[PDB]
Ligand binder design. Structure first.
Ligand code: MGD
Ligand code: MGD
Ligand code: SF4
Ligand code: SF4
Ligand code: SF4
Ligand code: SF4
Ligand code: H2S
Ligand code: W
Lengths: 966, 214
């Protein structure tokens, strides 16, 4: 026996940092009754096989940490000191701060007499860091209190990624999964530093290479990822659409696209209406005054049934494919090399390697995460990736996909639970004020007259009904429909989002903030303005692990606690290894983890904090009346608790769903009390509840499928590593999305050596088929209205084809592709005192604002202080030496950092001029550690109307040497 | 005897090995500051048995050659640290005959610290300024004898870290060297006859660190 682990109970867990979803083994002293003694990798987990990066490897130090919170801290208006206080107090006082603010601000009717039943005085940020069951409960709790201003982390990647991938494929999710990367023949890492930001991913990236894959990194900087790729191509910041457009041109010109895949499975053959055109950088239907498109000018020509017309010959000059060829002819190698900075020879090198995956026996994958996709045309960047993949037949196949890497451990799940302003759980929209009934709500769901188009969203009413029968199971859905708040149909949707929540706060338009598992005082762009804006709050509830820059903004740099009247509750939650629940990784793997040690001191699971905070409000309403008691009093919270505590097990069973009465569905009988086996057996009539239709199939009568730890694989399964018996993925354990596109019209795989599915003896064999139906009988994109992968995507604000509009404002004046310089649907000052492009990015050792990692002495050991990475050339121009203290400044602020001078950064040649990029990590903040430095968001601007997202990847700065004594 | 094969052609410098070593032994963190490098702690010490060293070397064409060196005791077949210690006291530095682990005991407090370090051709041994004991990597010998991989080997995601019987590890080192040479023609194994920690360098080992080989 190893002494350290003897008499310690062993439990499994899942990493509480990035979306790879690495397995842990936790050892807890006194056969479970004591503290953790050891945390390391789970050797049996199929993703990390025992591996951890330094963040995961240091979880022991995060958990067993005496800087952690012990109990609630109250800070009084104008006070300059915390006040240790009990839970029963803090919640009782918070319940009162909610009711008062709600009562005073509740509006039953908007300024048009439309029913809204909402509070606009309270806002909530968070959180991707909570369990799926805590995320689902939290969204329902906030909405029953009638909030609409509900946002978290997801917003920054959601806004670019989900619309681009949904327009293209019909879902917003990562198309494949981590293990599947090993099956790829060519891996294009572009807008990702995955060796640093998804490190276990490289286990599977390097196994791809072992079996002959070419690895390509396209990045402004040379990083730890670059050092282990076959090809490193530098790209100028924001030149991605030119680079990708050149690849589309190259693939089309050299007949490198996979014709049979393109003809059957994409909209290549659909006939666009004659109203469509593109001249001088503008699509038809442009409103020059309002800077917006009439998208009806982009509509397909329809047949006598309302189905889009098609030429299966691909000869009609208004075939999507011929318009695609015409559009990308401009993107020749010489102009793409000029604007990107990439050599003509490298462009040919990369284009030739990646385009070869067009062959059915080769697979290419594109990995991107955040990069610079947040700007106006970021959506078009990702659309271009989808279009390249659809041309090359890489969607639906092992080692293909658009691997849009999620950030946080449960950002997929937190999004799935609808902690964003515009969605309920399961991506059912939040009603607008014109959606006056449930009948009108369901009306919004487009229908298809095509018999081959599954158009699965036509099932929406069954899901919206089962969601309402989970929240209010004695009420009729149509009645229940009235309890939940609604947004203004008049108002621009982005007015409810992250960025406007910050502008509103600064104009004092909010009374109360929930910073639940987020650090806005560091994570918000333009931190000076945001720390100031928080002053204008009456009250602030912060739920986290440690005291932080958010909880304690009232004593931040330059602040007068006396002058500042904001009332602050700090509620300390327990770490991931101290609670039970599920997290949903980037591959949609919903993985169950267990308690090791009991919560440290008097910390609580988020589940118990929110449930107890709410039950106080429920109480206090039931004995003082007010506002609108219906939602609060009727919300079913019995199903959430067991033995006086939040029950992850019962919330997960509710989210899956159960039959509220005996029912017959899909030619089978089910009994009252029984679990729904898949979302196929949900109903609109009230026979079923389900908190989240995506979760229907995850916790059946057969048990908790999320908790499966079974490596059983068939030969065809093991060959591409589906691991279908390890945990569970939405939807219904489909591991690779769009997998019907992996086979021809008989159900033979295009690449049998790496089959995903195969029609064998009246069965689909391998992965779970993505859409039921005999071979050749259904279009393969079942969540699409028309059923195809969209090369031409008419729902996009900037046009149905990606087009280069310059996202760099200050140093660029010329667009070589059109007469339209900037985004025609889109104010930067460009002050000459700040001539350098500032950028922020991550390092392997730190997590987000650094709230978690700046408290872990081993990570601070490795990366103790804010740094500033600059070229040798810019070091020479400013006489900076390696290790010198430097002042970085912008119109928004200034800070000190240690210079790192390196050839890993090079000047961009922009219009005959050398333009310098200056790099900073955003992992630092004033609280801890001593001499760490402050947040890089001192330097960043607040913003524009398109996005609802900040800018953190390109902002104009100066850097000056700070002088020592000789 | 046991052996590590360390394929530095696969290292992402993720530094999971550096944290994993400290977590398994509950070693404290050093006081560190940035002096113009990601590298930290800047060197091995009494409380640091492994640090990843970073060196940037120019190459023609875009980018650099970034060299990563996860440094540790080489667990020499014939260790000169043992010879220099056996002068002042026997049993201070011992040899596990099952695994091959070279092990510093608490009797290193007795022997001459400086001289024992000077005799190491890899400059690995480190002395506590207070208790005058010597510390270094111990091959996680406790974990090895109970059938576990050393902390830094189990934690490594890339396939850089490998551990087992010296037979099949030498065989692998040769098989991998042949394959890596296709991409990195100057790829060589570090003193593969003399050590139990066999590094595959992608170029001149000295480029990684001055003491990378003896
Ligand atoms: N270690 C660590 N890992 C993390 C996080 C963390 O804080 N620390 N955070 C997580 C979160 S919330 C997220 S969203 C993900 C994001 O993960 P990534 O997107 O990988 O994160 P970044 O390092 O911000 O940006 C990636 C790369 O984009 C490059 N880049 C910058 N501008 C451009 C451009 O115009 N074009 C292209 N092609 N590349 C460009 C940068 O040089 C950088 O190498 O990481 C997650 N993982
Ligand atoms: N300049 C600049 N700014 C950026 C970015 C950038 O690249 N550059 N990145 C942006 C991006 S992509 C993102 S996603 C945001 C992220 O911004 P934030 O979400 O504010 O970042 P953190 O709060 O540091 O990270 C997540 C939080 O989860 C908390 N947490 C962990 N476990 C639990 C738990 O069980 N319960 C609760 N309640 N909390 C828990 C951690 O303590 C931590 O505070 O930042 C954005 N801001
Ligand atoms: S941070 Fe990501 S890669 Fe590292 S151990 Fe955790 S989940 Fe795995
Ligand atoms: S854990 Fe492996 S990949 Fe990471 S630095 Fe150590 S040897 Fe290199
Ligand atoms: S590497 Fe140095 S300390 Fe380790 S066994 Fe060899 S001589 Fe002794
Ligand atoms: S073998 Fe053990 S003691 Fe030696 S460096 Fe690796 S983890 Fe540390
Ligand atoms: S994220
Ligand atoms: W993110």
């Amino acid at each position: 026996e190893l002494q350290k682990l003897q008499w310690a109970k062993q439990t499994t867990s899942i990493c509480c940092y990035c979306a790879v979803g690495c397995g842990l083994i936790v050892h807890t002293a006194k056969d479970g009754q004591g503290r953790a003694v050891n945390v390391e990798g789970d050797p049996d987990h199929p993703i990390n096989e025992g591996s951890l990066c330094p963040k995961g490897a240091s979880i022991f130090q995060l958990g067993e940490n005496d800087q952690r919170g012990t109990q609630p801290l109250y800070r009084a208006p104008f006070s300059d000191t915390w006040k240790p206080v009990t839970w029963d107090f803090a919640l009782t006082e918070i319940a009162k701060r909610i009711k008062k603010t709600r009562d005073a601000s509740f509006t039953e009717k908007n300024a048009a007499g439309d029913l809204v039943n909402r509070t606009e005085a309270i806002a909530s940020f968070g959180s991707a860091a909570m369990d799926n069951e805590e995320c689902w409960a939290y969204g329902n709790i906030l909405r029953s209190l009638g909030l609409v201003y509900i946002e978290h982390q997801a917003r920054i990647x959601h806004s670019p990624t989900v619309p681009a991938l949904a327009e293209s494929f019909g879902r917003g999710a990562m198309t494949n999964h981590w293990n599947d990367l090993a099956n790829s023949d060519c891996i294009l890492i572009m807008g990702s530093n995955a060796a640093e930001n998804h490190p276990i991913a490289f286990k599977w990236v390097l196994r791809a290479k072992d079996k002959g894959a070419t690895l390509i990194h396209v990045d402004p900087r040379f990083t730890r990822t670059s050092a282990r790729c076959d090809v490193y191509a530098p790209i100028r910041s924001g030149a991605d659409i030119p680079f990708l457009g050149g690849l589309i041109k190259y693939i089309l010109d050299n007949k490198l696209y996979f014709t049979d895949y393109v003809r059957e499975y994409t909209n290549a053959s659909l006939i666009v209406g004659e109203k469509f055109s593109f001249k001088d950088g503008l699509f038809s239907g442009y409103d020059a005054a309002n800077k917006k498109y009439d998208k009806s000018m982009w509509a397909f020509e329809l047949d006598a049934n309302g189905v889009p017309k098609r030429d299966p010959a691909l000869k009609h000059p208004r075939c999507v494919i011929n318009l695609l060829k015409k559009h990308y002819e401009r993107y020749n190698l010489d102009k793409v090399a000029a604007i990107t900075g990439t050599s003509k020879e490298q462009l040919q090198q990369v284009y030739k390697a990646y385009a070869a995956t067009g062959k059915p026996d080769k697979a290419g994958t594109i990995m991107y995460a955040m990069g610079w996709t947040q700007h106006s045309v970021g959506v078009q960047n990702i659309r271009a990736m989808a279009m390249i993949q659809l041309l090359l037949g890489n969607i639906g196949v092992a080692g293909g996909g658009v691997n849009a890497l999620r950030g946080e451990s449960n950002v997929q799940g937190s999004t799935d639970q609808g902690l964003l302003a515009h969605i309920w759980p399961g991506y059912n929209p939040v009603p607008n004020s014109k959606a006056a009934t449930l009948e009108l709500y369901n009306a919004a769901t487009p229908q298809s007259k095509d018999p081959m188009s599954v158009n699965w969203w036509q099932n929406r009413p069954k899901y919206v009904a089962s969601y309402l029968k989970a929240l209010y199971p004695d009420e009729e859905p149509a009645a229940a429909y009235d309890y939940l708040p609604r947004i203004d149909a008049g108002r621009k949707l982005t007015d409810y989002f992250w960025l406007n929540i910050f502008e509103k706060m600064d104009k004092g338009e909010f009374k109360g903030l929930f910073a639940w598992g987020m650090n806005p005082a560091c994570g918000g762009a333009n931190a000076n303005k945001n720390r100031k804006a928080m002053g204008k709050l009456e009250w602030l509830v912060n739920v986290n692990l440690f005291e932080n820059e958010t909880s304690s903004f009232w004593k931040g740099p330059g602040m007068n606690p006396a002058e500042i009247g904001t009332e602050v509750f700090f509620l300390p939650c327990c770490v991931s290894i101290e609670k039970e629940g599920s997290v949903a990784n980037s591959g949609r793997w919903m993985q169950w983890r267990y308690r090791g040690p009991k919560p440290y001191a008097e910390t609580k699971p988020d589940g118990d904090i929110m449930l107890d905070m709410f039950k106080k409000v429920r109480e206090l309403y039931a004995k003082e009346g007010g506002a609108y008691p219906a939602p609060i009093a009727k919300l079913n919270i019995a199903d959430w608790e067991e033995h006086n505590e939040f029950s992850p097990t019962k919330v997960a069973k509710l989210m899956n769903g159960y039959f509220l009465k005996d029912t017959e569905v899909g030619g089978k009988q089910f009994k009252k009390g029984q679990q729904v086996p898949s979302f196929a057996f949900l109903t609109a009539d009230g026979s079923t509840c389900s908190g989240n239709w995506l979760h229907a199939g995850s916790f059946t009568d057969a048990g908790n499928l999320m908790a499966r730890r079974d490596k059983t694989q068939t030969p065809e399964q093991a060959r591409i590593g589906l691991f279908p018996n390890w945990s569970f993925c939405w939807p219904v354990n489909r591991r690779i999305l769009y997998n019907r596109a992996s086979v021809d019209k008989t159900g033979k795989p295009w690449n049998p050596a790496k089959a995903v599915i195969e029609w064998k003896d009246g069965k689909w064999v391998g992965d779970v088929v993505d859409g039921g139906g005999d071979p050749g009988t259904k279009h393969p994109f079942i969540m699409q209205t028309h059923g195809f992968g969209a090369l031409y995507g008419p729902g996009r604000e900037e046009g149905p084809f990606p087009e280069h509009y310059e996202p760099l404002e200050c140093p660029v004046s010329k667009n070589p592709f059109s007469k339209q310089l900037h985004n025609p649907v889109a104010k930067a000052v460009c002050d000459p005192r700040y001539p350098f492009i500032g950028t922020t990015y991550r390092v392997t050792e730190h997590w987000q604002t650094g709230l978690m990692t700046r408290r872990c002495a081993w990570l601070v050991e490795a990366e103790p202080q804010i740094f500033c990475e600059i070229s040798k050339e810019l070091a020479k121009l400013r006489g900076i030496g390696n290790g010198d203290t430097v002042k970085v400044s912008s119109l928004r602020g200034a800070l000190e950092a240690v210079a790192i001078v390196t050839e890993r950064i090079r000047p961009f040649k922009i219009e005959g001029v050398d333009v310098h990029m200056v790099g900073l990590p955003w992992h630092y903040g004033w609280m801890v550690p001593k001499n760490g430095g402050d947040t890089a968001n001192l330097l960043t601007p607040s913003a524009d109307p398109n996005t609802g997202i900040p800018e953190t990847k390109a902002f104009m700065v100066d850097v000056r040497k700070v002088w020592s004594h000789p | 005897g046991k052996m590590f094969f360390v394929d530095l052609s696969r290292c992402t410098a993720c530094r999971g090995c550096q944290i994993a070593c400290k977590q398994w032994k509950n070693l404290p963190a050093e006081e560190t500051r940035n002096t113009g490098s990601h590298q930290n702690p800047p060197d091995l010490s009494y409380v640091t048995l492994k640090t990843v060293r970073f060196t940037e070397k120019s190459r023609k064409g875009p980018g650099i050659d970034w060299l990563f060196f996860p440094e540790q005791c080489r667990h020499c077949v014939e260790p000169p640290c043992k010879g220099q210690a056996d002068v002042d006291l026997e049993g201070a530095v011992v040899k596990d005959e099952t695994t091959g682990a070279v092990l510093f005991t608490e009797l290193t407090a007795k022997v001459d610290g400086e001289s024992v370090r000077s005799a190491c051709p890899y400059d690995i041994p480190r002395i506590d300024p207070v208790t005058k004991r010597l510390s270094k990597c111990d091959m996680c010998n406790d974990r090895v004898q109970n059938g576990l991989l050393p902390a830094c080997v189990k934690t490594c995601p890339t396939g850089t870290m490998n551990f087992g019987d010296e037979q099949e590890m030498l065989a692998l080192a040769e098989k991998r060297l042949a394959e890596v040479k296709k991409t990195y023609p100057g790829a060589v194994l570090g003193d593969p006859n003399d050590v139990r920690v066999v590094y595959l360098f992608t170029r001149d080992p000295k480029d990684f660190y001055e003491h990378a080989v003896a």
